[PDB]
Amino acid sequence: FTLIELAIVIVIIGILVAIAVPRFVDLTDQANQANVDATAAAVRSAYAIATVQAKG
Amino acid sequence: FTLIELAIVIVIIGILVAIAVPRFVDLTDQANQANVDATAAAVRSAYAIATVQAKG
């Protein structure tokens, strides 16, 4: 590579770095809560259906 | 140096010059645009992650 091409590369690397980038976040607490809540809704419906099946 | 060696040098200098050589170019506009775009992608993801953290 010519010295000019290396100079251009040295410039552009410095500009394509120094972007923002997102953090990874452990969102499993919020997702676990929604899983527990959705499951609780399912248990209530499953119970209601069971009261008809059981006739009691 | 002998006169022959100087004559040879006078010939070869004239041929190793008269190559092409690249121009340096201010490519910072294109690089800045890519930085802004990559940063915009990061802001969208950071916002999406924040809507889960905020629960709203």
Structure tokens at A26: 């452990």
Are A7 and B21 in contact (CB < 8 Å)?
A: no
Query: How far apart are the C-alpha atoms of A34 and B12, rounded to whole Å?
Result: 78
Resolution (A): 2.6
End-to-end CA distance of chain A: 84
Q: How far is CA B17 from the centre of its chain?
A: 25
Closest by CA to B32, choosing from B23, B43, B40, is B40
Query: How far apart are the C-alpha atoms of B20 and A8, rounded to whole Å?
Result: 17
- Among the partner residues A7, A19, A25, nearest to B38 by beta-carbon distance: A19
Based on DSSP, count helices (H) and strands (E) in chain A, helices before strands. Answer: 2, 0
Query: How far apart are the C-alpha atoms of A24 and B42, rounded to whole Å?
Result: 11
Task: Give contacts of B32 with chain A, Cβ < 8 Å.
Answer: 15
Query: Are A16 and B36 spatial neighbours (Cβ–Cβ below 8 Å)?
Result: no
How was this model experimentally determined?
cryo-EM
Helix (H, G, I), strand (E, B) or coil at A41: helix
For B32, name the nearest residue in chain A, comparing CA atoms only: A15
Query: Are A12 and B27 spatial neighbours (Cβ–Cβ below 8 Å)?
Result: yes
- Give Cβ neighbours of residue A2 (< 8 Å, ≥ 6 apart): B21, B22
Query: Are B42 and A21 spatial neighbours (Cβ–Cβ below 8 Å)?
Result: yes
Query: How far apart are the C-alpha atoms of A14 and B44, rounded to whole Å?
Result: 23
For A18, name the nearest residue in chain B, comparing CA atoms only: B35
Query: How far apart are the C-alpha atoms of A24 and A38, rounded to whole Å?
Result: 25
In the chain, the amino acid numbered B46 is A
Backbone angles phi, psi at B24, to 5 degrees: -70, 145
